[PDB]
Amino acid sequence: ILSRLDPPEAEVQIDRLITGRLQSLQTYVTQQLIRAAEIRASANLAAT
Amino acid sequence: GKIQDSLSSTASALGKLQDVVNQNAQALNTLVKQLSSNFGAISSVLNDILSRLDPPEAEVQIDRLITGRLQSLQTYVTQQLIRAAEIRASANLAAT
Amino acid sequence: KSFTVEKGIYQTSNFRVQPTESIVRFPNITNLCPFGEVFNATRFASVYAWNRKRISNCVADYSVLYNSASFSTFKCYGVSPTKLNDLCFTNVYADSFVIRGDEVRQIAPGQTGKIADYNYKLPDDFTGCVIAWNSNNLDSKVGGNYNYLYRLFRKSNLKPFERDISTEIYQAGSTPCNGVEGFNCYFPLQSYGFQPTNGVGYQPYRVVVLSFELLHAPATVCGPKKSTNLVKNKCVNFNFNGLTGTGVLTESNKKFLPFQQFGRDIADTTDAVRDPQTLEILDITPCSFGGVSVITPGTNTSNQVAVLYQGVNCTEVPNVFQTRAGCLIGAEHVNNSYECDIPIGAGICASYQTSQS
Amino acid sequence: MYICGDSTECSNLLLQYGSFCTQLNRALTGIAVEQDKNTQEVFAQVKQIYKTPPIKDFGGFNFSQILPDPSKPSKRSFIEDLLFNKVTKFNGLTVLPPLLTDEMIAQYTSALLAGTIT
Amino acid sequence: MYICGDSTECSNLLLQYGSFCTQLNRALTGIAVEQDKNTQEVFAQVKQ
Amino acid sequence: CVNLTTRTQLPPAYTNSFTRGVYYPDKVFRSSVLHSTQDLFLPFFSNVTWFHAIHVTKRFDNPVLPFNDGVYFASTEKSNIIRGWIFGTTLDSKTQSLLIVNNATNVVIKVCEFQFCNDPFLGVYYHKNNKSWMESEFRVYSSANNCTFEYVSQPFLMDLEGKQGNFKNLREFVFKNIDGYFKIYSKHTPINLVRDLPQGFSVLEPLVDLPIGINITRFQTLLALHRSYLTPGDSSSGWTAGAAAYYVGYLQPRTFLLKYNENGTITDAVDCALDPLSETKCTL
Numbered sequence A: 001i002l003s004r005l006d007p008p009e010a011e012v013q014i015d016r017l018i019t020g021r022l023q024s025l026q027t028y029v030t031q032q033l034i035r036a037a038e039i040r041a042s043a044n045l046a047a048t
Numbered sequence B: 001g002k003i004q005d006s007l008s009s010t011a012s013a014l015g016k017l018q019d020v021v022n023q024n025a026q027a028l029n030t031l032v033k034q035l036s037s038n039f040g041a042i043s044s045v046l047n048d049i050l051s052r053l054d055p056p057e058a059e060v061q062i063d064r065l066i067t068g069r070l071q072s073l074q075t076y077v078t079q080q081l082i083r084a085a086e087i088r089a090s091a092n093l094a095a096t
Numbered sequence C: 001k002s003f004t005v006e007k008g009i010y011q012t013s014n015f016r017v018q019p020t021e022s023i024v025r026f027p028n029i030t031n032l033c034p035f036g037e038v039f040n041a042t043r044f045a046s047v048y049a050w051n052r053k054r055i056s057n058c059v060a061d062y063s064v065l066y067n068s069a070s071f072s073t074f075k076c077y078g079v080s081p082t083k084l085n086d087l088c089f090t091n092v093y094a095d096s097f098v099i100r101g102d103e104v105r106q107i108a109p110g111q112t113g114k115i116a117d118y119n120y121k122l123p124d125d126f127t128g129c130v131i132a133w134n135s136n137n138l139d140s141k142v143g144g145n146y147n148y149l150y151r152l153f154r155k156s157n158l159k160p161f162e163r164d165i166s167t168e169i170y171q172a173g174s175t176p177c178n179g180v181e182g183f184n185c186y187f188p189l190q191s192y193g194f195q196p197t198n199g200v201g202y203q204p205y206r207v208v209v210l211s212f213e214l215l216h217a218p219a220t221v222c223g224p225k226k227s228t229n230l231v232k233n234k235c236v237n238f239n240f241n242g243l244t245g246t247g248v249l250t251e252s253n254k255k256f257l258p259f260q261q262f263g264r265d266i267a268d269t270t271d272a273v274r275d276p277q278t279l280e281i282l283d284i285t286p287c288s289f290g291g292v293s294v295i296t297p298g299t300n301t302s303n304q305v306a307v308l309y310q311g312v313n314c315t316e317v318p319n320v321f322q323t324r325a326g327c328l329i330g331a332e333h334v335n336n337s338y339e340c341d342i343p344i345g346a347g348i349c350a351s352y353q354t355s356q357s
Numbered sequence D: 001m002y003i004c005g006d007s008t009e010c011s012n013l014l015l016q017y018g019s020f021c022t023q024l025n026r027a028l029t030g031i032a033v034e035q036d037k038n039t040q041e042v043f044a045q046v047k048q049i050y051k052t053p054p055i056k057d058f059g060g061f062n063f064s065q066i067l068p069d070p071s072k073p074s075k076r077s078f079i080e081d082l083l084f085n086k087v088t089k090f091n092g093l094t095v096l097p098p099l100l101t102d103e104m105i106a107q108y109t110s111a112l113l114a115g116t117i118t
Numbered sequence E: 001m002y003i004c005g006d007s008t009e010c011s012n013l014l015l016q017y018g019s020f021c022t023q024l025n026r027a028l029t030g031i032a033v034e035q036d037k038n039t040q041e042v043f044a045q046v047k048q
Numbered sequence F: 001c002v003n004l005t006t007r008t009q010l011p012p013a014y015t016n017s018f019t020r021g022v023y024y025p026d027k028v029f030r031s032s033v034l035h036s037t038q039d040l041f042l043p044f045f046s047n048v049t050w051f052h053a054i055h056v057t058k059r060f061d062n063p064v065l066p067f068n069d070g071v072y073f074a075s076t077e078k079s080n081i082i083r084g085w086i087f088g089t090t091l092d093s094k095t096q097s098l099l100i101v102n103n104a105t106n107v108v109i110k111v112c113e114f115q116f117c118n119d120p121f122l123g124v125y126y127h128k129n130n131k132s133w134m135e136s137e138f139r140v141y142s143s144a145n146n147c148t149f150e151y152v153s154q155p156f157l158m159d160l161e162g163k164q165g166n167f168k169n170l171r172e173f174v175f176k177n178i179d180g181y182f183k184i185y186s187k188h189t190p191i192n193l194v195r196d197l198p199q200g201f202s203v204l205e206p207l208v209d210l211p212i213g214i215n216i217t218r219f220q221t222l223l224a225l226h227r228s229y230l231t232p233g234d235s236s237s238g239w240t241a242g243a244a245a246y247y248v249g250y251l252q253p254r255t256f257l258l259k260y261n262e263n264g265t266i267t268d269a270v271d272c273a274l275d276p277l278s279e280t281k282c283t284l
């Protein structure tokens, strides 16, 4: 995308990719926490 | 007697409680720092954007800031719930 | 979303103290900026070596520019044209040059064209207003005019906010001219064709670019708006040198170095400011952020409820009780301790006891 | 307040989103209520606040440090004091006070301890 | 690295967004530390 | 233009200047908060090229020095021998250029198309009839054509002694050129008896801000020639200057974590970029 577009036009285009990708990371990071918390409760049972 | 000495000498025994204090403090701090970010807008401060922009044009900039701030809050609330749930489990273990 | 309410405390309608008055403070400078002189000039520098003037330390009113409306084009970017006076900016710059009407579109942010990409290129983040208006009578004579020139060729694109005053004959690759200027070798300069007979469409336009940056340092390009006497210890709206914030204003303890003009807290938010006219230093705080919680026994039980504000200091609000959790109204407290029917926080519980309150 | 700030103009734009604001507030309120609930369960297991006897006949066990001190404020035990010492509305965000004060929590803890020995 | 990729231009836009980039990494690291703790609790039950 | 004779050619002496010339990055005041600002700074423990303006034998050198963003000048003087500075691109009197005098009145400045000679200086003579140091040849420049900016700074005073001694004072400056603004920062340090830059932390305080468009590739320094009766008595050989020393260090973009004291003086600062350890502190 960068090679094809100059900086004034590229910002709006690049921005969309950034926004989307940010969502993917947050969703992944949020999912990990939920799984991690489940494992932590789960791990404690195993420890107990 | 030893336990009194141990408590006064090292902070290792009270470490876990503090993690809770620090973790909560850090979460609150991040949200506040979030406001400064432009989020693609012309300027971070809300008033400044409104003062120098006419209503239709003011709208796009206002929107970006609203969207970015909503995301910040969502992360905090979502982050807070997971921590709350984690703390809740400890309390259930702890009361018992 | 119910017509009946269970016993307990509910939080609704968060309240913030309103600003009683608005105070605007500006630097006390009365010397009108000479925008007019720049606008009217016998000679305007050509695109190759554009004329730039830095205007500062004075008061300019943009109503005449906006108000006069004698100019063909008044494009404004990042600043509302109507809202120009209220905003205060520092480091204002002025550009002077004349180009033909067809190329007026080219001199704008993120646009292409020969002169824009070869003589003068506006930055992408530009926040200024561009003005254009024909002066055909001035650009028409008996012998014509050809002291206005624009570059045709250049090896690389001209940088934003930079000008080329250099004079050297054009070259491409090999067969270097060394002054020869035949075929593949050209002189840098190129004149215009402004003539009275010549059509309006390609007729000369006089273009001025007004560019300014804001919120960096104390600046004195402030509008004509009048200042007011400072107000202290009372929640009121305030503006200082184009900076707007609302909070309680009090004499500030913290020392200030001569260079410094602003103060900030841990969260990088405005904490202190200096009235320019006064020279004093003051602390800004938000008046109050209020969570209003209504305590009621029930709709079945009673129609009387007690309202509590958590933030409240019992004076901020515009019967009364003081509790560690919050300022409390509508409840008469009792000295003895009873089991907590409702939990108000900070070791306080409110219950309905009976004659009835 | 956080999302749109003081300005009414900005707040109207936020209204279009609708249920976001309300949802966020409710979740946080629920979390606060849940937090208050934890303290009650963990500490309030006794209906009656038992008070330790004046007599020090504990069969040679010295409980002076764990038990409350009348000279010190808040009736917190010496061991408790050390723990307290070691641990250490800004912009539309308010930290509500706990339902039970630190002093009140100490009494419940003191009561349980008092109950256990006697 | 994930969101912006190798390109420098992409990185600048990410800076504008805030500490989201930084915050997400911190959350994952917290999760990573927790895994070690769980295993430690479950299996390090013996001194020798 | 008039010249000078019998100069000694030697390789440039080097020293290490560490944690010096940290300048309040901007205008904000903050108390008890650690802040990271990505503003050009002399790198800590950065290499510094020392210079000599001392006769000692027949030694006198004040040649042009390359200039980048980091134009940190740290002269050390006693009887006030180093006075001014020159900025510019080619010093051709055709490109707009900067120039100063350090008089007892002000650090007088100018933005003018000046035609400098090959060997500019400030001249002072010891007269037998009256014990005072007067200017003898102020032919620093030829004339000025176009001057878009003229300027005089705040009043201050200078001692102007004609004696010999160790450098009782210290002066640091950081010249910068950013976003169409020329800027300067200063501090007087009463350091005692150290040949090298003093161990410790001191923070430069901005003195002046000038909005200028001039582009300057390199800069030069001004010396005070200590003309006396013992000298031959001409502009080419008649001079006996005395001790002078000055050090120039460049500035590159770096991130500094700057500690802020309760009052706001920047008591201490740690460079994140410089060390592996140092980088941890920024993240931390």
Ligand SMILES: *[C@@H]1O[C@H](CO)[C@@H](O[C@@H]2O[C@H](CO)[C@@H](O)[C@H](O)[C@H]2NC(C)=O)[C@H](O)[C@H]1NC(C)=O
Pocket: F093, F094, F113, F145, F146
């Ligand atoms: C500043 O001074 C220079 C001379 O140093 C001026 O350049 C001359 O200007 C005239 C009129 O345009 C030309 O005929 C000459 O050829 C120029 N000199 C040379 C050597 O070519 C310049 O015009 C002045 N600029 C300002 C803005 O006043």
Ligand SMILES: *[C@@H]1O[C@H](CO)[C@@H](O)[C@H](O)[C@H]1NC(C)=O
Pocket: C028, C276, C277, C278, C279
């Ligand atoms: C203008 O401001 C200066 C500096 O703050 C002050 O000395 C002066 O009296 C002011 N003048 C008036 C007339 O308000």
Ligand SMILES: *[C@@H]1O[C@H](CO)[C@@H](O)[C@H](O)[C@H]1NC(C)=O
Pocket: C313, C314, C315
């Ligand atoms: C506000 O502050 C404190 C809070 O207890 C107390 O002095 C009183 O409630 C109020 N006092 C004022 C505003 O002087």
Ligand SMILES: *[C@@H]1O[C@H](CO)[C@@H](O)[C@H](O)[C@H]1NC(C)=O
Pocket: D056, D062, D063, D064
């Ligand atoms: C209990 O310990 C305290 C502190 O060491 C001591 O003063 C006291 O004498 C001990 N026991 C009794 C019965 O007083």
Ligand SMILES: *[C@@H]1O[C@H](CO)[C@@H](O)[C@H](O)[C@H]1NC(C)=O
Pocket: F014, F016, F045, F046, F047
């Ligand atoms: C300073 O410059 C010298 C060259 O004279 C070089 O050998 C040395 O590595 C440099 N010092 C540092 C600390 O980089």
Ligand SMILES: *[C@@H]1O[C@H](CO)[C@@H](O)[C@H](O)[C@H]1NC(C)=O
Pocket: C162, F089, F090, F215, F216, F217
């Ligand atoms: C600055 O001066 C140099 C020559 O020293 C020249 O090559 C360069 O283009 C100048 N640039 C600007 C951008 O003023």
Ligand SMILES: *[C@@H]1O[C@H](CO)[C@@H](O)[C@H](O)[C@H]1NC(C)=O
Pocket: F262, F263
């Ligand atoms: C600067 O700080 C010092 C030391 O913290 C303190 O006395 C005061 O806040 C300031 N004082 C003076 C007196 O220079």
